Symmetry: none
Subunit: 71 residues, 4 copies
């Protein structure tokens, strides 16, 4: 009777800090380096809490997340 509770989850595929002044100054075409993550890796999140780890995969041209570890 709560098993049916629907959770909005997001894929967190990197983390970084910028100052507000830095963020205001970003232009299209510039690349931000996002250290701390293996490229294509994503964490499955509810808000700030991690629920699962995964890899971004191609599914017939669509984006999929293949779960590698439940957390």
């Amino acid at each position: 009777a709560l098993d049916s509770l629907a959770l909005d989850l997001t894929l967190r595929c990197g983390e970084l800090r910028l100052t507000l002044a830095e963020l205001r100054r970003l232009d299209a075409g510039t690349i931000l380096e996002v250290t701390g993550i293996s490229p294509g890796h994503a964490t499955l999140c509810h808000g700030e809490q991690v629920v699962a780890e995964g890899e971004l995969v191609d599914v017939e041209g669509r984006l999929g997340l293949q779960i590698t570890r439940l957390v």
Copy 2:
């Protein structure tokens, strides 16, 4: 001095909805369908708010975000 505010940003590579039951049935190997983003793309987020859109790139093995648009 507010320009000096350090913001914790995330790269968001999509979203999905799962019930508590589904989240409980979830195991290694399961492929979940992702919505809200074209593949190879990501948004730059402060909490739940988008501040930019971009494309994921590889920079000598490190992940990069090539900004395509600032949400301003």
Copy 3:
């Protein structure tokens, strides 16, 4: 500001060297010339002969990138 829209043709500069006309005449394929001004992996961003930024050369999926280390 109207001058903000000014398109500048900037150059990546990977150092410099001085040759006499005789030397440049003698210069054949395969010769390695010593470079001054930068150490390997570095470049300046240049407008004409004016340095406007310094940075590091990176590879972006087979493309050249300049990672800015300082704006001048």
Copy 4:
């Protein structure tokens, strides 16, 4: 004019266009993508005139330009 004339040459290892507004807005740590060149390639220039092409080489820690084509 004589063979003893000394030319100040530069290594051009890429070209790009930014507006002044874009250039004003650049921050340390951001990456600019420089299309139209193979990484490590450089042209040897007198002003805006190409006199040679080559590859950037590391020789015992020191930067060199290995000449591939004379112009």
